[PDB]
């Protein structure tokens, strides 16, 4: 499955001018566009090589939309203070996420249109794309406003309509970057612990996409018992990295195998120390 998602944030800062407003857009999970109100000459800007192909009317159009959205979030931050009876001196955050998951058959899988205030769920469009889930009483007010205003149907028209169609466009125009694969380069480090045994750490570097399996074996049987791990984490260049470690007895290292499974490999990588 593929996706086009937009992550949006407005943060208030009373006494330091208007709220900071930011937009980021992703295809699958890769950043390609961004808008930041604290930039010099704030405009929608490319963040990936393949989107630069778009003509000037694309960037003028998206900059107009972002500036329109920034104004709405200014009102929403002021409204939020009333709904929760909060003083107007504090910093508050409002977050928005909207986009579409589609399959290869071009079919919408899921559509998202959800908000959070000060880091907690506020209102979310349900999977039917017709009803709203409202967290607290304050969000139920909003739900009533949006119910009588037909909000769901207008917003659904973006989710089933423009979102799906531009994702197809982005997937063809960015195909060589988005659907590429980069294989993992793996190695193993060896560190004697103070207790005399040895930490073996298996690294996988520079792979794309992010999904990967990293396991330790002992002549054939996996070792999820004493296996330390980090979550997959990003590099600047758009690739990822991961490691898993086990503790083994000194001098018996060559009995342990690290296994790496990834799209960019035809067959799994086996390696030992």
């Amino acid at each position: 499955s593929h996706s086009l998602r937009y992550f949006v944030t407005a943060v208030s800062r009373p006494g330091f001018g208007e709220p900071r407003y930011m937009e980021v857009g992703y295809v699958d999970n890769t950043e390609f566009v961004r808008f930041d109100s604290d930039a010099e000459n704030p405009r929608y800007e490319p963040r990936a090589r393949w989107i630069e192909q778009e003509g000037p009317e694309y960037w003028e159009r998206e900059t107009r939309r972002a500036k329109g959205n920034e104004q709405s979030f200014r009102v929403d931050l002021r409204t939020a203070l009333r709904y929760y009876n909060q003083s107007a001196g504090g910093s508050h955050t409002l977050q928005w996420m909207a986009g579409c998951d589609v399959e290869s058959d071009g079919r919408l899988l899921r559509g998202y249109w959800q908000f959070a205030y000060d880091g907690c769920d506020y209102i979310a469009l349900n999977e039917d794309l017709k009803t709203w889930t409202a967290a607290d009483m304050a969000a139920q007010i909003t739900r009533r406003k949006w119910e009588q205003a037909g909000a769901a149907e207008r917003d659904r028209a973006y989710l089933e309509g423009e979102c799906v169609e531009w994702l197809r466009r982005y997937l063809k125009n960015g195909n060589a970057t988005l659907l590429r694969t980069d294989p993992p380069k793996a190695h193993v480090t060896h560190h004697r612990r103070p207790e005399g045994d040895v930490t073996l750490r298996c690294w996988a570097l520079g792979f794309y996409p992010a999904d990967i399996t990293l396991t330790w074996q002992l002549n054939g049987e996996e070792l999820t018992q004493e296996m330390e791990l980090v979550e997959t984490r990003p590099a600047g260049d758009g690739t990822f990295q991961k490691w898993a470690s086990v503790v083994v007895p000194l001098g018996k290292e060559q009995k342990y195998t690290c296994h790496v499974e990834h799209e960019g490999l035809p067959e799994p990588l086996t390696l030992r120390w």
């Binding site: 998206e62 939309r65 709405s72 009102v75 909207a98 406003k145 909000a151 917003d155 979102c163």
Partner: peptide, 9 residues
Amino acid sequence: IGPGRAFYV
């Protein structure tokens, strides 16, 4: 193309 706000909270 991104989404556009048309309703207020």
